[PDB]
Design a protein around this ligand. Structure first.
Ligand SMILES: *[C@@H]1O[C@H](CO)[C@@H](O[C@@H]2O[C@H](CO)[C@@H](O[C@@H]3O[C@H](CO)[C@@H](O)[C@H](O)[C@@H]3O)[C@H](O)[C@H]2NC(C)=O)[C@H](O)[C@H]1NC(C)=O
Ligand SMILES: *[C@@H]1O[C@H](CO)[C@@H](O[C@@H]2O[C@H](CO)[C@@H](O[C@@H]3O[C@H](CO)[C@@H](O)[C@H](O)[C@@H]3O)[C@H](O)[C@H]2NC(C)=O)[C@H](O)[C@H]1NC(C)=O
Ligand SMILES: *[C@@H]1O[C@H](CO)[C@@H](O[C@@H]2O[C@H](CO)[C@@H](O[C@@H]3O[C@H](CO)[C@@H](O)[C@H](O)[C@@H]3O)[C@H](O)[C@H]2NC(C)=O)[C@H](O)[C@H]1NC(C)=O
Ligand SMILES: *[C@@H]1O[C@H](CO)[C@@H](O[C@@H]2O[C@H](CO)[C@@H](O[C@@H]3O[C@H](CO)[C@@H](O)[C@H](O)[C@@H]3O)[C@H](O)[C@H]2NC(C)=O)[C@H](O)[C@H]1NC(C)=O
Ligand SMILES: *[C@@H]1O[C@H](CO)[C@@H](O[C@@H]2O[C@H](CO)[C@@H](O)[C@H](O)[C@H]2NC(C)=O)[C@H](O)[C@H]1NC(C)=O
Ligand SMILES: *[C@@H]1O[C@H](CO)[C@@H](O[C@@H]2O[C@H](CO)[C@@H](O)[C@H](O)[C@H]2NC(C)=O)[C@H](O)[C@H]1NC(C)=O
Ligand SMILES: *[C@@H]1O[C@H](CO)[C@@H](O[C@@H]2O[C@H](CO)[C@@H](O)[C@H](O)[C@H]2NC(C)=O)[C@H](O)[C@H]1NC(C)=O
Ligand SMILES: *[C@@H]1O[C@H](CO)[C@@H](O[C@@H]2O[C@H](CO)[C@@H](O)[C@H](O)[C@H]2NC(C)=O)[C@H](O)[C@H]1NC(C)=O
Ligand SMILES: *[C@@H]1O[C@H](CO)[C@@H](O)[C@H](O)[C@H]1NC(C)=O
Ligand SMILES: *[C@@H]1O[C@H](CO)[C@@H](O)[C@H](O)[C@H]1NC(C)=O
Ligand SMILES: *[C@@H]1O[C@H](CO)[C@@H](O)[C@H](O)[C@H]1NC(C)=O
Ligand SMILES: *[C@@H]1O[C@H](CO)[C@@H](O)[C@H](O)[C@H]1NC(C)=O
Ligand SMILES: *[C@@H]1O[C@H](CO)[C@@H](O)[C@H](O)[C@H]1NC(C)=O
Ligand SMILES: *[C@@H]1O[C@H](CO)[C@@H](O)[C@H](O)[C@H]1NC(C)=O
Ligand SMILES: *[C@@H]1O[C@H](CO)[C@@H](O)[C@H](O)[C@H]1NC(C)=O
Ligand SMILES: *[C@@H]1O[C@H](CO)[C@@H](O)[C@H](O)[C@H]1NC(C)=O
Lengths: 383, 383, 383, 383
């Protein structure tokens, strides 16, 4: 039958197993070619390569190697420096570039052949700003980790100029994990309402230090700017009276989604987590949920485009790929109900501006969905 | 005698002449090989190439072409997306990469072979924060243009948490030049003390719209986060009573520096400026001053390193360059008194953290130096 | 048929075209003899002569030359020294003298044969004094240019003795245009409410210097004692928040008037204005509007007086003209709806004491009519 | 011997004798040709003509009649409308025009052939402004009669903007003499310090009405802007405690001057004054003192210019007079010690800017000199 090779560039884990985004890329390909309603006669193979993700030259060598063998799409590195190098290769040679993670799009880049399945922080930081108005906050503290988190939360930072907030912007201490001298200044300065822009690995580690500082009381309210708050072990904090608000795009109330997440924890089973962490065992990251979705949204666009053949492109003798102009238009016009919900693009750029969130909070039983955010509607927090 | 080829990647201006950074690269090479005290027996040639500066793939092709012919250094593109691609090529192949413009160094990039002659905004935004304390400001408004200007001014944004400022952070309207709906909200909100993070082309255009709005009075004070405030036509604003503070690293009080800037306006003479702009005629940008300096600081390191030969490196069959490890250590240990003053590097990274500024302000006679900033000392504003 | 010669004495422009008052005199004659409802059988010819306007001896030679050839009226020079010489010639020889510009009538001059179509400053400076009471001013600054402007604004100057004003009377600097040392004393003395007695050429030039001084703010209010404020390019000042009040007798809301002003800009088309002025292109001065009106008000009086023949009068062998006694009474009793509105005389003297003004002000869309002044009524400022 | 005809245009007094300025012109000619040290061999004759002084056409006919017969100078009418007509005739035909009375020089008149022996109100109203500062006044009231008196006192009116005065500007009631409704408003408004700009005939008549109103007390102080305050009958006001300050240019302390004023009252003896006036009998007006001086200052310039012949000029066939260019330069460079003191001109214009005043006041013995004003020095009021 017809074969159709995809490309992937992932992190080179030296001693341990493959990453969460590489398993999810392998799990999504093996699910589609097993299924018959989705792609009846097309066997997807793949061409995964490993880089260091902090080397734009190694990413550009591995991308041209997959372009020399021939791929239909590039599922991209997961770092801002590495993805920007592969994006310009995929733009030049005509092949689509599938992004599953946020990076800064510079404002004067004329790139067409890319879509990003990560929820755009233009939309996502208007969801946080709806929560600080629903909770009637008037003095907020934004705590970020790296300097790129000012770009992500800029719609929240540009808005004491509209509303009546009073922001204090702080940064987690670099070259360490000990965020206790930060938390002393926040206790002494009476900063009870705090937004944390972290990953779920760092948001879990600074709740231990907010427990040891005695800042997990019924006075403190924490909004987390991460979509994996549902993946934290919240058992030490469930009875403290703390309110811990957040979001969740991973649609874990659909039975078909919870079946796949159940198959995730069972079939993978490798790399048992550190027991002293918190961050529980049987979960999908939203980083691996979007890579499972990224193979399916492209697989919509290959149903709608038969007679598609894989060519062998060259980066040196530069010529664009033939079918790439139409095939990019079918990925941008693709709708899919994945693990993360409705997957629709923007048609100006390739960004998920329209998506369905589920605002979850901490009750005495764990994390519980207490509303829904949508860009068209807003907060439907009727619990 | 000995020849020594340098490499340059510059902007492709289609109809007009070469850019200001490309003339300054050609003017600095022609000055050194004419001079005899600086490089007595070494004739510098060059290998300038043109790219679009918004194409990391075109920058990576032009960099390997200069590496195939053979260069001693790469003087780099002047854009964050393009320079990060060439930096990883120069790191891998061992050749130094000379940067004359700010870009975001991501916090976990292990690159060694680069130096940046642009004044670091870690130091430069502590100079602005000394001015808002010397002027005893308690309510400031930061106005930036692109989202990367939050990274540049983050030491100013993270400091109502230390001091008693009250920041309101606004952005210039994208996809236009009409900043009048921004200035209406700043007049109505009584924002008299304003910091503008702009280029000198955009800071000149929003003083016309602050004149048309009647915001150029004796109530308004403007700090400009650009090193080319000395290059603005300030004749319409000289009598209005406005105070317009800023900085200047271009050492225009040294006779040897003002001789070279005089040779700049005479010998180039091409591309007459738009008469309806403001931004006067006979000036050097600080962008072209740092490219004139960048050829001289590398020329210090080739005096201290004889028997240096140019090899022909390959990006495909990847091998590092032989003399690049020692020759990078001589560029990082080079001192030079250029057009911008003392040029010293950081030895942890290749960043100008230590530099001499000259804080200038608007009087009734024009722009006038009213102090000096230094990282060791601080504001010596004794005028 | 019947011919009827008029006389005109105008400014000798050496290199350029004819003046605005001489075109309007030629445009009004060519309109009347083309029209059939107005003067069905009477062809008006004219006898225009040029003087320097600062030479009462040259004006008296040119007036007797037109009296020797024979005219029905003299439309007069436009200067106080020259018009007073021709007025006494026209009084002695019986011929009417038509004035379209203000001059000081000395209080003991027994002259009968003259009418003045310019709005009398006895009435016109009571219109300004209604505005300083409607705007509730209590400290005003009158700025005039020549010493005759104290005679014009004497009803405004004699009235801190009645009302509770506090006048400070200043003069524009002679032998120059640089009114900046005047404006420094007005800023330092906190003179926010200012009346300018200028022409429209000088009122436009001191708004540039009030912009450069930063005196065009929302604190400053400017009343202009000129009827050509509607002819200023106000685009630099439209957004500054300045209020700029004034008057307008040129009835530019009537369709028949705006048709003639449209024919003015099209048909003349000569002498393009200086582009660096301000004072826009397609306008009539009120000085040329009153000369267009002056030919029509006399043309009313020749409809009501048939069998009128032109005699050849002599200044040496002095005898009065026959029909001049009755024909002067018909000009003083003439009503006309011209470009400037209702044209009625005073019957004691020949002065327009009763006229219709339209008080205009500066909004964010330009100059806009915000009321109406009338000597019988007063300010009907209901906008 | 040599004859030298002068011209004069004076007021046509119908029933009574000749005017005071015409007697003084006849008395000065008869004194010079009698004297031998002044003009040893030159017999001055004269060509006096009478006009109505309010008719610029009659003044221009009489001036050309004296130019047709031939004169060396024109001693001019004494009215602003009539003198401006003769000035332009004398400028055109080259003959000097001698003025003995103030009139408004319009600011853009290019006339050369005229000198004015009346003290310039640019200097004279700085003498009044020195008195309101010497008397430490802070609230003054200027009362004038005709609208031209704002031009005369404009240096006094433009100076609450410099000093700390508070002017209230009032006007004497036209078409009447009854200034009692004016004086009621000045008593009720508590206007004790008053400047009167009047003639000596009107300043004498409003002291009767200030006596009848009971405003001649020790609370009221009156400065008079007339040089004939020494000619008022002050016997009713000498004991009332009123202070009545003023000036005097008529040098009545010189023995040679008081001899001529004694010959004035004796030899003329005609037109006895009205006994109910006040304004005493045996005085010279300063109007007739300056006409006595005007013949002598021109007689200086004919000593310094021999071979001077009188030509017959024509106003119709216009040609300038031959010797007029040099002879005008000798009148402008003439020094003379007349009845009014030092007579020096200005050399830019023909105006007496430099003159010697004698500030006189009312004591219990009459009017008494209490100081001296000079433009170079100022008030030497050491009594
Ligand atoms: C395709 O992309 C553009 C660019 O981001 C999207 O336009 C953006 O639309 C959002 C709302 O739909 C605008 O954000 C904000 O909306 C809130 C709530 O309605 C309101 O406070 C303001 O009006 C505010 O602007 C955003 O400004 C706008 N971006 C631009 C550049 O105009 C567009 O919605 C996307 N198309 C889709 C999702 O179909
Ligand atoms: C090489 O680079 C490092 C990194 O930029 C330089 O260290 C930096 O030094 C500045 C002061 O010179 C630090 O800023 C702040 O200074 C204020 C007062 O000036 C002080 O109170 C703060 O606690 C803070 O120290 C800056 O934080 C620091 N950077 C780091 C990462 O520690 C270093 O000076 C450079 N070495 C050279 C130029 O030789
Ligand atoms: C013919 O001319 C005379 C002279 O100008 C006109 O008389 C003038 O009328 C105005 C009022 O319309 C007088 O102004 C002042 O008005 C204020 C309030 O409006 C009032 O309180 C004052 O007492 C004064 O009346 C002006 O003084 C007056 N002129 C004279 C010399 O009395 C007359 O209206 C003209 N006739 C017409 C147009 O039919
Ligand atoms: C020839 O005529 C000119 C024009 O009037 C005379 O210049 C004038 O000189 C006077 C003083 O000499 C200036 O007046 C004022 O002086 C006082 C006291 O010194 C002082 O407060 C100011 O400086 C004030 O200006 C007057 O401004 C000035 N006029 C001009 C147009 O500059 C000149 O003095 C005459 N030449 C003579 C008398 O030799
Ligand atoms: C094979 O893929 C198809 C996708 O078209 C799956 O069909 C889905 O069925 C569910 C049933 O609840 C519905 O949401 C839609 O009909 C399909 N989902 C989509 C289009 O997102 C089908 O279930 C897959 N086969 C297996 C065995 O899972
Ligand atoms: C050629 O370059 C050298 C640079 O070393 C110039 O020599 C002087 O070098 C010292 C070293 O610090 C500086 O302090 C001086 O300011 C330099 N002199 C200058 C700039 O005039 C040398 O002058 C250069 N040659 C020419 C012709 O300018
Ligand atoms: C010729 O002049 C007459 C002037 O009377 C114009 O006729 C109208 O006259 C009445 C009289 O009051 C005015 O109210 C009208 O407004 C006049 N009509 C206008 C100005 O259109 C007549 O129209 C003139 N002829 C032309 C061709 O304009
Ligand atoms: C004739 O005129 C001369 C003018 O030169 C008179 O001379 C004056 O004499 C007095 C004597 O005190 C002095 O002021 C000057 O010598 C002359 N005055 C001037 C020049 O102004 C002379 O007195 C006259 N003759 C008679 C009889 O009066
Ligand atoms: C907990 O959340 C609820 C609503 O979500 C709010 O009423 C309460 O104040 C919160 N507790 C805090 C902010 O300590
Ligand atoms: C909001 O939530 C309620 C749940 O009761 C649901 O019925 C409704 O459709 C939701 N959306 C809107 C727009 O109200
Ligand atoms: C101008 O600067 C001076 C000194 O720093 C200050 O007094 C004045 O207020 C400033 N002008 C402003 C803030 O408009
Ligand atoms: C600052 O002021 C002068 C200006 O040149 C300088 O000489 C002085 O040494 C400086 N003082 C310091 C750095 O303490
Ligand atoms: C403009 O006019 C309005 C209404 O008369 C007034 O409120 C405002 O103060 C004026 N602006 C000034 C005086 O600057
Ligand atoms: C003033 O305003 C309206 C608008 O023109 C007008 O109709 C009205 O009659 C006038 N009222 C007066 C003059 O009282
Ligand atoms: C009279 O004049 C003297 C000085 O000339 C002064 O002291 C006194 O106050 C005057 N009398 C008044 C102003 O009533
Ligand atoms: C002022 O008057 C005195 C009178 O004693 C006199 O001596 C002096 O010369 C006069 N002039 C000046 C300039 O002092």
């Amino acid at each position: 039958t017809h074969v159709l090779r995809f490309g992937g560039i992932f992190e080179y884990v030296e001693s341990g197993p493959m990453g969460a985004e590489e398993l999810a890329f392998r799990f999504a390909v093996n699910t589609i070619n097993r299924n018959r309603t989705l792609l009846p006669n097309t066997t997807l193979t793949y061409d995964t390569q490993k880089i260091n993700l902090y080397d734009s030259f190694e990413a550009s060598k591995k991308a041209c190697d997959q372009l020399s063998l021939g791929v239909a799409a590039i599922f991209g590195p997961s770092h801002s420096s590495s993805a920007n190098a592969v994006q310009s290769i995929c733009n030049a040679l005509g092949v689509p570039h599938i992004q599953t993670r946020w990076k800064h799009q510079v404002s004067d880049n004329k790139d067409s052949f890319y879509v990003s399945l990560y929820p755009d922080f233009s939309s996502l930081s208007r969801a946080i700003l709806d929560l600080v108005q629903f909770f009637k906050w008037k003095t907020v503290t934004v705590v970020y980790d790296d300097s790129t988190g000012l770009i992500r939360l800029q719609e929240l930072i540009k808005a004491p100029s509209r509303y009546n907030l009073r922001l204090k912007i702080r940064q987690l201490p670099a070259d360490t994990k000990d965020a206790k001298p930060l938390l002393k200044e926040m206790k002494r300065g009476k900063e009870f309402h705090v937004i944390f822009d972290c990953s779920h690995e760092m948001a879990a580690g600074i709740l231990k230090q907010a427990l040891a500082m005695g800042m997990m009381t019924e006075y403190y309210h924490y909004i987390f700017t991460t979509l994996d708050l549902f993946a934290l072990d919240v058992e030490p904090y469930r009875y403290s009276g703390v309110n811990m608000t957040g979001f969740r795009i991973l649609n874990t109330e659909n039975t078909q989604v919870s079946s796949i997440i159940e198959k995730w924890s069972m079939e993978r089973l490798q790399a048992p987590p550190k027991p002293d962490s918190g961050l529980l065992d049987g979960f999908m990251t939203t980083d691996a949920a979007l890579m499972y979705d990224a193979v399916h949204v492209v697989s919509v666009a290959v149903q709608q485009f038969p007679q598609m053949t894989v060519s062998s492109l060259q980066c040196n003798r530069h010529k664009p790929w033939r079918f790439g102009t139409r095939f990019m238009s079918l990925i941008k016009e693709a709708h899919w109900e994945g693990l993360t919900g409705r997957i629709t693009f923007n048609k100006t750029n390739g960004l998920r501006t329209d998506f369905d969130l589920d605002v979850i909070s901490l009750k005495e039983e764990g994390l519980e969905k207490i509303g829904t955010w949508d860009p068209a509607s807003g907060l439907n927090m009727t619990e």
